Design a protein around this ligand. Sequence first.
Ligand code: FES
Ligand code: FES
Lengths: 69, 64
Amino acid sequence: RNKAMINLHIQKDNPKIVHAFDMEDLAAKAVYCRCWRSKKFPFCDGAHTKHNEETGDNVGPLIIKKKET
Amino acid sequence: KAMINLHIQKDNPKIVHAFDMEDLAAKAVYCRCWRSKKFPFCDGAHTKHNEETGDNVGPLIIKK
Ligand code: FES
Ligand code: FES
């Protein structure tokens, strides 16, 4: 009946987890976690697969690429 | 174990978004909470989510 947290474990000493990157620093491809289960947060490490299988969810990452380095 | 995404595009078995930086404006704010009405962009819905659940999630920002 009570709504669940999305992030169970990550950096709980931080009252609001925000990441901010400059485009100029970006790699050719970055894969960012939107499931809060990655062990390498804020990057996606495939943990969303286990999460989706265990919970029936359908979440996946955000991919940011550069057309040119 | 509870789902994270409650309502967004449930006919897609795994929601992935991919963008090229050259297409972006000087600032893009991406939702990591699956509560935005403008998903995949952040509309501030994370604030209510954090308030109601005690969570601490927030967006990912790509800026110039
Ligand atoms: S590990 Fe979280 S979206 Fe892939
Ligand atoms: S609305 Fe989801 S992270 Fe801001």
